[PDB]
Structure formats: C-alpha cells, structure tokens
C-alpha cells in the first residue's frame, strides 16, 4: 500500500477528476440457464497514458443438479455442475489489451502441530494372602497434526494472456451427511463413490436415492454467480477505436450413476460428460464510451 | 474491489450526482400472517446507460409454529415452517430487465484435521514373593476430524432469470434441548424423527409434548424477516415506460405428528404439506419514477 | 449493500438534504417500576413517497427479582422475570402503517464435528522364570461433538402487522453457580428445578436459600433497557394528519418456590404467575411533526 | 505510525498537491507464458528533494505443471513451477537509485504449549470366593507442543541494492490428499518423494499417475500473479534526465518422476532442472514523466 | 487516545497547517551488502515550542547466511545473521535532541491454564467357572498449561538518551524441520546444538548438512529490513542551526559449525563471532530544511 | 459513546474551533539512566468553563538489568527492576487540579470451564482352553478449567487526588526458558527462587549463571517507556496564572542472588533493595500558553 512507502493513500490510483461512463448489459440464455450480465466502466483519466474500461462479468449460471435417467429401478444417472466458467477473449488483430483482472490466485495455508510427552507412574497393589506387588512404568509419544480449510468449490485465475482472460469455479470436495467428505475421485471398494448416495441400502428406486439438493451445496442446484473483473487498455492514438470482445459462461456436468448390487447401493462419477456453453459478442466503442451487444 | 485494479475507490460505482426518488409500499396480508413491505429507489444517472430501480423485499413472513389436530391424547400433529420465499417477476412481452439481486450464493468451507501419533512404553513390575517381570510396548493412532457451521435455515438465491428472480429459506437442521440436531429426514428406529420432540417418554397427552417454540429457533414461530434487493434495469428509448412487476410471499409448511407407542413417543414427519402465497402486482412508472400497488 | 450492486454507498438511503424534527418523552411507572422513554424523529424526505416518524422505544423495565412470601421454614417463594415486552400499536381504522422495525429474528447456527480415529498396540512382557509373552491389539472410534453459543435471554420480534409490533426479551437458561444450566423446566428427581437454589442440602430458612442476585443475571434484578425502533409511514394526502399510537412496557413474573423433603431442599417453578403491564397513549401530529403524550 | 509520535496522521507522507501522471504497459511473452504489467507513476512533490518513480509490477506467470515425457507406462515425468520472480535493475553508472520497495520479508512467529499433570488413583476389587485386594497408584507427565503456519509458498525480498531488487515466490511445502505436507526434499525408503504422487499403487500408467492440477495449489498450474512496488528516487539536477530499467520475470521448474517399481510407485524430485527467463528494457523520461517499451 | 479524555481526536497532534519538507537520501555499502535509506521529513508548526525533524530509517541489511569454511568432508563453518542493528548518534555538545522514537519494547504475554479432574469407575466381571468378581475405583488429576508465543527474531529498542537512540533486531529462537525450536545456547550432549543441523546421521559431506536458507528464517539470508523513526527537536533561538549526525547500520554473525565424530553430526555456536560495521554522517540544515550526505 | 445516546459522534467533545499550543521538553538523567520527555498541549476553548493543559509523560526509563557484585565464584548478585514509576504532583495550596488521567485500570477476566462425563464399556474374553470371560464398566469423571493471560508487567494507576497522579508498572511473573512462570516469591525448597537461574547444575562463575537478557522481557534491560496522559485545568479567573509542577520518574530495583550450595545452585530475591528517583520541576504559564523547565 501506499502508505508503506511513505506515499499519501490514493495518490498513485486513477480516476481522480474523471467523468465515467458506465453501463448494464442483460442477456438471458434459456437453453443454457444462465443469467448473463456485463457491468461497464469507461475511464478516461488524462493523467493516465491509456483508455481504460473495466468489464464486471456477473449474472447466475444455473447449476441443474438432477436425476436424468430412469433405467428400471436399480439404475439411475444424476448429471451435477462439475465446473463454472467465465471467458473473455480479444480477438487478435485487436490493439486493445487485457491489463488487470481479479480475483487471483491465492496462496493456500495450513497449520502443522507436533507434541512430545513423556511419563512416569507406579502402583502397589496387596491381597488378603498379605501378597505386595509393585509396578514401575514409563512412556514417550510424539504426536502430528496437520489442519487446513477446504472450500466445496475453488475460485480460480486461468492463465492469463494479453488478449484473452478467465476463471473457473471447481468443484472440489463436499461433505454428505457428516460423511466424508467426498470428491470426484472418492472410491469404497463396497460401495464405489458416496459423493451423492442418499442412503447405503435403501428400499426405494434408484431414482430417489440421490442426496437432497437442500442438504448439498447450494452452487449445484440453484447455481453461482459470478463476480469477476477484466481491465482493458486501450492506446488514445490506436488508428481503429473500435473493438470486439466474446465472452463465454460455461457449465461442466458430471455424470453420477447409482446401480444396486446384490447387496447394497454403488456409485461411480464420470468426470466433464457434458458441457454447456453461451457466447456473446459485445462492441467497444472507445469514442463514444458505450458497449453493446453485437 | 476497484483498489485491487489501481482505481480510485467508488470511481466505477453508479449513482454520483443524482437525485433519487425513493418510497415505501406496506401492505399486510390477514390470511397468511404476512407483514409485505416493497422499500424501492429509482436511479436516473445520466452517465449510466439504463434507467435503474432497486427494489428492496422487507417486512416479515410470520413463522405459525401450532399445534393443530387432536386425533387422541396419543397422536397430535403440528404445522410448522419448513422454507419462506420470496419472488418477484417481470411481464415476459416486456423490456425492463433483472439486471442484479442480493445476497447470493456463497460457497462453503469446513476445517479438516489429520493427526498421528506413536508412543513406546515400558515397565517393570515384582511381588513380595521374588517374582520379577517386565514389559516393553508400542503404539501408533491415526485420527481423522471434520469440523463445519450450520445454521438453523439456509438462504438460497434461486436460479434467476432476467424475467424471474427469487429467494428460498429453508428449515436445514436444529438443536432439540442440546441433541441432535434433527432435520426433516431424522429417522431413529423407536423415537422417529426426534425434531420437536419435549420427551421420550413423558406422560401427558401428544398435544403437551411438542418442543416449547421459545426453546426452538425462532423463525419457526415469530418468523423471518426478508431483505432481499432486486436491480431492475430499462432503456430510456423503450416506447412502453411503464411496467408491471409481481411479488410473491410464501411459507411452506410440514407436519410433524407425535404418537404414542405403548413404549414410548414416535414422531413423523411431512414435506411439503401446506402452502401459503400472498401475491402482490405493482406498477412501476418510469418516468415519473415512483411504484404503486395495483 | 449499495456497493454489493455497483452503487455509491448510501445513494438509496433515505434522509439527506431535510431538516429533522426529534424528541423526548420520559414517564416513570411507580406501581410498576418502569422507566419509559421515546425518543422520536420525524423525516419529511421531499424524494420519498411518504411522511416518516421512527420512534426508538428505551428507558428500562426493572427486574424485580424478590421473595414475597415465606409461610414457613419449608417453603418460601421468590418472584422474578421471565419475559420483558414492548409493544406498540396504531387504530385499525387510519392509514398510519408500520413500515420497518429492528432489531429482527436472526438465524442462529451451531458447530459440529466428527472425528474417527483407529489405532494398533503390541507388546512384549518377560518373567524371571523365562517366559515370554505378546500382545497384539488394535481399537477404532467415533466420535461427534456438538458446539453452540447461549445466551441468558433471548430477543425476539413478534410477528409484526402494518398496525402491530413487538418484541419479547424472554429467559432462555442460566448457569447457576458453575452448575446447569438451568431453565424453566428443569428437573431433577431428588432436588427439584435447582434454578435459583442457593444450596441443596444447606441448612438455613428458606427466603435465604435463594440464589444471590449478584451472582445471576443482571437482567434477573437490575432490569432490562429496552433499544427498539419502529418506522411509521404516512401518506402526505391523508386527511386526517394526527395519529394516536399505544405503547405497552410488560414483565411477565413466575413463580420460583422451593420446599424441604426429608433429606434435601426442592425446588419448583410455575410459569407466567403475574404480569404487570404499563401503557401510554400518544398523539403523533404529522403536520407540526411533534409526539406528545396523553392526546 | 505518525499518531505513535503525536503527529497528525499523514503530515510526514509525500505527495500532496501534486499532479500524478501514471501509465501501464502491458505485454505478453507467448514462448515463456508470461503475461507482465508494469504500473507506473510519476510523483514530483516540489517539497520533496527528489523526483519519484513508482513502479509496480504486475500479471501473471502461468505455473504450466505438466508431464512432459513417458517411457512407457512405468516411467514418466512432470515438470512444475519451484519458483516465481520478479527483478529490477538499473544502470550501474547512472544516477537514479532504487529507494524502497514492498513487500519485505517479515518476522515468523510460532506457539509453544508446555503441560504438566499428575495424578492418583486407586481401586478395590474382589471376587465371590470373599477375597479382596488393591491398588494405589500415581502418575506424572510433561507435553510439549509446537504449532505454527505454513503457506504452500513463501514471498521473499532478495537482498536489494541501490541498482538492483527482486522477489521470489517459492515453494515451500504441499498437502497432497490429506497427507503430508511433503517439499522437495521429502523421501521415504519405500515410496520415494510423494509430493505429486496419486497413489501408490494404482494400475494405470505413469504419465495417468500424478496429482491432479486441482487437487493442489492453482499457483503450479494456473500460476501466480506479481504485486511488487518498486520506488526510483531521481536528483532534479543530474545531468541525463533518461534511464534505462530492465525487467525480469522468470519460472524455476524442478523435475518430478514417478517410476513403478515393480510393487508400487516411487518419485524422485530433481531441482531447478529448467529456467525460464523473460526480460523486457523500458526508458524512464523524467522529463516528460512518462515510460516506454523500448522493443 | 485523546477521544479517552473527552478532547476532538488529533487536537493535540503537531502538523497542523504547515508546509512539510522530505526528502530521500539513498546510499548501498558493496562491502557490507547494506542497502541504507533516510526518509526525513522537516515539521515547522509556528504553534509548536520547537522545530522538529522526523528521521525514518529504512532499507535492508542482507543476511549473508552462507557455508565459509571447510575442512574435509568431517567438518565445516557457517556464518549467519544472530543481529542486525541501527544507532543514531548526535554531538554531545549541539542543542538538538532526540525527542522520540518508534516502535519501542512492549510488555510481553502468556496464557495459563489450570485443570482439576476426579473420576469413578466401577466393573463387575465373570468367567466359566461361574466366579464373579468387581472393582470400585476412583482418581484426581491436575494439570497446568503455559502458552505463548516466540518470534524468530525480537526487536528491541535499545536504552536511549536524548543524544542517542537504537534498535536491535535479535535471533530468538526457530523451528528446524518440525523439530526445536532451538537457539543459540540449544545443547544435546550427543548431537550439540542442532540449530542448523539438516540430518544427524546423514552421509554427506559436513557443508551439505546445513539447513537450505529456503527452509530457515527469510531474515537469516535475504536480510532484514528496517523501519525504525525518530524525532529530533530543534530551540529555534539557538545560536547554531546545523546538525551532524551518524547513522549505523550493523550485522553480527555468529560462527556455526557441524563436526563429524565417530557416529554422528554434532553441532556447536559460537556467538557474536563476527561484526559488520556501516556508517554515515549526514548534515541538518535546520534553516533550509534539507539532509544531505557529507560523503 | 455519544451514539449510544442518540448523540452526534464527536459533539460533546471539547477541542473544535481552537488554536492548540503544543511543546516538547526533553532531558536526560544520565546517573539513573533516564530519558525524560513532556508533550503538552494547551486547549482554551472558550466553550468549555475552564482553560486545559494536557501532559504526556514519555521517554524511557533503561531498565539495567546486571551483575553487580560477585564475592568468590560461588555467590554472585544481579539488579533488576521490579517496577517502574511515573508521577506528577500539583501544588495543595493552588488552584490548577488534576482533572483526567489516562491509561487508568482495567477489569480482568477469566475463562471458566466445567465437564461432565460418563461412560460404559464392556468386553469378553477366552483362551484356547476354551475357558471364557466377561466385563462390565462404567465411570464417570468431573473437571474444571481455569484459564486466563498474564502480562509479564502490570501497568496501573496509582489512586489519585486532584493535586496528585501517577503510575507504576510492576514486574507481575516470567517465563525462564519455556519453565515457571516465577516471580518475586516462586519458592522452590532445592533451588530457592529460580527466577533468573540461567542453569542449576552449571560449573561456571556464580556471575556466569544467569539468564541472558536477550531471552527474558526486554524491559528488565533496555527498559520501558512511558506513554501517559494527564489533564490538568484551570479556572480563568484564577488570581495566580502560573503553577509549578513536579515530575518524578522512578526505577525500583530487586537484589536477585545466586549462590552455589553443596551440591546446585539456589536463588534468593530481595524485594525493593534500591531506588533511583530523577525530578523535574516545569513552570505552567496559562496566559502565555507555554511550559517550560526550571
């Protein structure tokens, strides 16, 4: 921060004395389920050496989590969001660059404990035989310990270039009925993967032994809503003061099968089966300060 | 946050030097026990490129917890709130579009602990009669835990549309008298569902034995209080400047019936048994900005 | 909040640019030992649709934990708080609505976490005689653990109406010397609801062995300042601009009483035994924006 | 803190009342992944002796954790980023000075418990047969524990001169799916290092047996994104009012192996086997207060 | 805080209304690797009985953890960082004074605990032959719990006076590898001090057992970098209105060495070996209100 | 606060619409080791009923922490300092009073926990002699916890009069090498009072034996620093407009020594042995709003 380096707060941003042009762009994709909005800012500080417009990717994307196949009544399929994805690309005859973006990448922490102990004890013991026995012990124990958080899905920064930026929001390991928890990957040699397993040896169809979408993380059924930030420069002397940018919302779904056994009830995961994606072309108009869609 | 990309805080935020026309619309609905209030500001900023109307759903949905049939002193049953909702939705033949809401959907975490551990010991030991004896042992443990929050009801932004949007509250799990907690599926094999059970085994009738509501979460029977926020957006060129907009107040009601088994007290409980909806239609006019009910 | 949506903070609050009409009204209940206070504000906002008044209800309801009976050594009673209320009302038949109350219910939550944990154990032993002996052993466990925080009353808002509001402040349980806690409906076999027993087999009179005030909630004797707020609105087109409002201050008593069994005191308590309730009228006048009270 | 001295906050702070020009210069190294930012701004505070430059370094250096060779299905490799960093450098024999920077290295910290216990206890057992026996017994121990944090990498300020600074971020240590954490140095007989290992004894492919990019930290894959600050201090009155600075970003990728054994797999871990280096030359004009790509 | 005596916040604060003067003074030390930096700022406040100068202290002092000496594989020397210092020193006979000075020491803290438990137990228990047996038991357990925290490095304001001030940033102690922590004075009778001990059995050669600098403290290698401030007041009515004044910038190693004997690596410290000295004169125009260099 | 009672933050405050004369006086005692520092600020605001001089007492008093006398290599002494004093003293027979102070004592606290706990278990038993056993137990066990911080000083406020204030912060205990705490009356009956023992067995010096200064609170050697305020006022119609008033600082120190007995070294400390005392007087002139030594 500024004030770290002797710099008074707020003297190195820009904006200062700067009208700004902002504006909403809605758009909803019914075959999809996803809810698109692009929040604008044009900035064009004269104190600043480029055009800058700050595009806020927002909106839900729907997370669909349901039963999509009824194969008699030992077998069923349950299709979940695996992954949420938001894209913005310049094409690459534009001058217009990608800049900035947040959030980031950040760097995970954990908590390490290590204990030493060391005892000493003694008894004497007696009976009615007028009998003494008598017991000198001694004991060491050296104990680890390893605690972190883990969230049900990761946010996360893709590789950036200068012409084309993204996120993803992962699914990464979820607790089922204070089991677990479980991830994509999780395998019981008896009953396979329990991501999304109601019960282990329930008497319904296999249709209605999926865990409640009420008791899972809200993100697979009702969905997430994204809230990322892309800035864009744009030199004041560039020849073509117009420019195209896509942007792309995308869903990733899983493939989890419950079949029964002899027995009891088995899950297996199939990773990334289906994928779902919306495109937009936006214009920027950096003369008039205005975006619009197509 | 514009700080984390170099800009001047606030300097992408709308709504600077303009007057906004703000109001409030009560209305309370007898029938449904529903205190409905609309809190609404009309954004006109001219360096904005849409006309923007928050709306802002209040007031409060009463909880109704009660205990309603007498079918013996043995069985009883009990109507209470198992989710509240709130929805508003725009004419789908029109322009104004659901451009934003508050709040969403977070994602969650829970802390997870590995721990390991080794010890060696070793004594000696001897009676009177000469005998002496020793022993040398060793150990190791592996320890797994999972810690995590729940509340008592869950908020959960549905999937919204740029026509549709909505909120649900639902009944996720609750402490009975420091055991449990208990959710809508608790099954124990001789007490049932154990939710709002006072006792196992007292001795008075069904209707005497249902948890007191002071001693339960207190949206089950006081209620719960909406604040949700919309963000409605309109093109200034629309030729139709005016627009409907419906706002739907829900409960949704289980029953939770106790019997008497000659041992001791069963309790079920009933999804989804009874709805309540209050509905509301208001006009919002556009240009002379401000919102009435009818 | 506004910045949660890309506005300005504060750019939909209502408030700026007008000149505020405040004020006190103080009356203290003797019979009931109330001490009331409304503070008001009137906000004629030109941008909002309608008159605002916010009427924050304070002062304070005391305790009045006490004995008031004590027939003989085996039994006295002890009257105390088990409820607080505040309760505001408007006539059915004006358009005056209540518009917006705080505080309101908020969810509560809890922790909880499972743990599972197996190990393995040997050992070897020896005699003097030459004897060699082992030991092979293994253990699993689970285990569940649940956390939650509790306070000593609980503040509640009752279902509110656009003419009715309230809030009970209600005894939830209390922690009784290290021990409990204890509640309403507390029971033990032997010793009966040990709420406020000051000691079980203590031998002294029984208005004595009651728990020392100083040592329970403070609530429980001293009182309880209610800090409520109310928002009434008022449409400018109304042609009867004058509005009377009821406030009711309300403690609700039980009735703690303990008698001695042959080896160790016993303790009961009965519920919502009294109720001491104090009321005012007002007169809101919308158009001099002032409150005043007995109109 | 100026408070700490009884000073108002922020008088001893430059720059107040004066005109800032900043600039970004953005670009991208398709070859090494690296997209870099530099930030910049001009502050010339007449009540400061010197002129100031203010840059930050920004973007983003793509991790790029991926195998890269297989020998068949019992052998393969995967490269992934140790380390991250960023320098700076100024002409030797030029007159502008590196003044400051941010962040810096900080001072770790870590808890220690120290527990003492003792005990006594005893029994009385006995048999139908009218025998009786006991046991009277004591114990005592001492426990140590050690806790503190680590980050899966740590930020450090390389030793900085007046022509010259940096970063770097590197690796420190990783849980891989519950266990460890492991680091580089990590070996156990049997498995080898096990840092990115899946499973142990998995029947699929080498190259099919690394930790998956998602299950461990997104700096490996995705990458990491600089946010360092850099102060240049420039005399008014030195003669040549242009400086050249140069810029490095630079991934120090280590070498991950995993070979079956013909029971189970093994990892070796080599470290710094590849460097990638980016660099890029700007003109810094004092006079103009503006900064230029000089490619 | 001034808001605790019921008087405006930073009403009594110097800086009000007054033009300040700063300045950055920049020079690196090749031979003692000493980045060293002066941020100063001149405080003229006409309602303030003296002229005041704020002297920021910052830049960095290089650690220098590296391995210097060998003697065969069996032995070998490392030079580490067990201080790092800087001192302020005024002519004993000038009028200017050293007012005060930030950060300065703060009172320490630690968390105890005491636990008291007692149990019963019981168990009834029977075989083949149809004996029955029992045991009544019963124990009391005490425990006591110290915690508290330990920074890798303390810093320290040295007793100032009012012509001369210091700090020293002083090695604590620090965790090797899960293990210690250690310090300076740590003592196995085996293995010695193991503060920088990599393996205590490993078959190396005695310079690659010591702990990689990654995996120590940032402070010991990449150095430290302070931010330490200092007032001096300046009577406006005295006769001579220039100060000189040096500024020291120091780094004391220590000397560790690890040993082979016949079995294992053995570890010793010798403390305050070596000491790296860097100063500086400036000049205070207390007149002009500038700092400068006298080379 | 002014919030809580529907007050404007900051309107009862006194300061606003003045000039506020300040001053620095500084001294140093170099026989007691002492920098001296006053801050003071003189507030006339003519809307409260009397002038107000603020008097922050600063500096550092060294802590000087040494050996100071050995007698043979088998009994050596150490100084160390128990306490450190700030006071300011008014004249009784003028009118300017003491009227505020800060810091002043806080409340302390503590945690406290009780548990419960009960459990049964049971097991059988056998051997190849085909002879078989059984088990039955059950326990249960109480505890309490007692857990609360302890500074290594205590800083207090002395009670004060209108004409006299001051503090002292006292040595309250200390950690010796992750052992103790100890303070001035730990009794050990083999090694006496351990506060400062660096070793109980050591065959150096009995000056070579006591706890380095770098690994105990830094304010036992270096020293402590005063930052206290005190608020004098004074009527505007008071005949005298100058008071002289006194400022004491004061360094206690403790005689912490070690000797060698037959077989390990023992400490012993003696309470308050020596007490530095340095003075200052200043003049308050209230007309001419300034202070100076005299």
Redesign the interface.
Do not use: C
């Given at each position: 921060?500024?004030?770290?380096?002797?710099?008074?707060?707020?003297?190195?941003?820009?904006?200062?004395n700067?009208?700004?042009?902002?504006?909403?762009l809605?758009?909803?994709d019914?075959e999809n389920?996803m809810?698109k909005?692009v929040?604008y800012?044009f900035?064009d500080?004269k104190?600043?050496?480029?055009k800058?417009l700050?595009i806020?990717t927002?909106g839900?994307i729907?997370?669909?989590y349901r039963v999509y196949s009824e194969e008699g009544a030992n077998k069923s399929g349950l299709a979940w969001p695996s992954a949420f994805k938001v894209q913005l690309q310049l094409p690459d005859n534009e001058v217009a660059?990608?800049?900035?973006?947040?959030?980031?990448?950040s760097?995970?922490?954990?908590?390490?404990?290590?204990?030493?102990?060391?005892?000493?004890?003694?008894?004497?013991?007696?009976?009615?035989t007028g009998?003494?026995?008598?017991?000198?012990?001694?004991?060491?124990?050296?104990?680890?310990?390893?605690?972190?958080?883990?969230?049900?899905?990761?946010?996360?920064?893709?590789?950036?270039?200068?012409?084309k930026v993204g996120w993803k929001?992962?699914f990464?390991n979820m607790?089922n009925q204070?089991?677990?928890?479980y991830?994509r990957?999780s395998w019981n040699p008896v009953y396979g993967n329990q991501l999304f397993m109601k019960t282990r040896n329930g008497s319904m169809k296999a249709a209605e032994n999926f865990l409640?979408p009420?008791?899972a993380?809200?993100?697979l059924?009702?969905?997430?809503?994204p809230d990322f930030?892309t800035?864009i420069?744009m030199d004041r002397k560039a020849s073509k003061q117009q420019t195209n940018i896509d942007v792309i919302y995308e869903r990733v779904r899983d493939d989890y099968q419950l079949h029964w056994t002899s027995t009891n009830w088995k899950g297996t995961n199939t990773k990334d089966k289906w994928t779902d994606r919306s495109s937009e072309r936006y214009k920027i108009d950096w003369e008039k300060e205005?975006m619009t869609n197509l």
């Open positions: 921060a500024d004030s770290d380096i002797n710099i008074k707060t707020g003297t190195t941003d820009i904006g200062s700067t009208t700004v042009k902002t504006g909403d809605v758009t909803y019914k389920g809810h909005k929040f800012s900035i500080d104190n600043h050496n480029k800058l700050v806020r927002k839900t729907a997370g669909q660059q990608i800049s900035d973006y947040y959030p980031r990448n760097i995970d922490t954990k908590e390490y404990m290590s204990t030493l102990t060391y005892g000493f004890n003694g008894n004497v013991t007696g009976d009615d009998k003494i026995g008598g017991l000198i012990g001694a004991n060491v124990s050296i104990g680890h310990t390893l605690k972190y958080v883990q969230p049900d899905f990761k946010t996360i920064l893709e590789s950036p270039t200068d012409k929001v992962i990464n607790v204070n089991w677990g928890p991830d990957d409640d009420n008791k993380s809200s993100l059924s009702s969905g997430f809503s930030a800035v420069t205005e």
